[PDB]
């Protein structure tokens, strides 16, 4: 269970049915279960908000380049999806825009509550690792 911590919002104790309650048993598996190259830190007062950063995988055309992931964990989470999508600075890949939208069926159209944020970020990894561009 890599990861450390940077700051706990582990700690609050979350309503046992409240939509916050769900984003902190889904932060602490990704503390536990980091989806390879992947660090974390989540915004302060603000648990709905998460920042993965993805260093590229030495073996993939964007090997050692920094990538920055945000997720927003909307009102009524997990029964709508998490918005996620990359930060300034895109990867330029088939399935990523320039806005950073990336086009993923698990993200909308085949997402469904029991996804879990660890999995969504870490198909995202091996879907930037593929061809080239």
């Known amino acids: 269970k890599p990861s450390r911590t940077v700051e706990k919002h582990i700690k609050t104790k979350y309503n046992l049915g409240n939509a916050n309650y769900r984003i902190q048993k889904e932060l602490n598996n990704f503390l536990k279960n980091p989806p390879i190259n992947c660090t974390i830190d989540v915004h302060p007062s603000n648990i709905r908000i998460w920042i993965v950063q993805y ?9 050692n380049e920094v990538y920055k ?56 990894i091996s879907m930037l690792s593929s061809a080239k561009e």
Do not use: M, R, W
Not at 55 to 63: P, S
């Open 55 to 63: 260093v590229g995988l030495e073996n993939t055309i964007y090997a």
């Open 69 to 124: 992931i945000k997720i927003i964990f909307p009102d009524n989470y997990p029964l709508k999806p998490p918005i996620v999508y990359f930060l300034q600075k895109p990867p330029k890949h088939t399935h990523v825009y320039s806005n950073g939208d990336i086009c993923l069926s698990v993200l909308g159209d085949d997402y469904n509550p029991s996804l879990s944020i660890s999995g969504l970020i870490l198909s995202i």
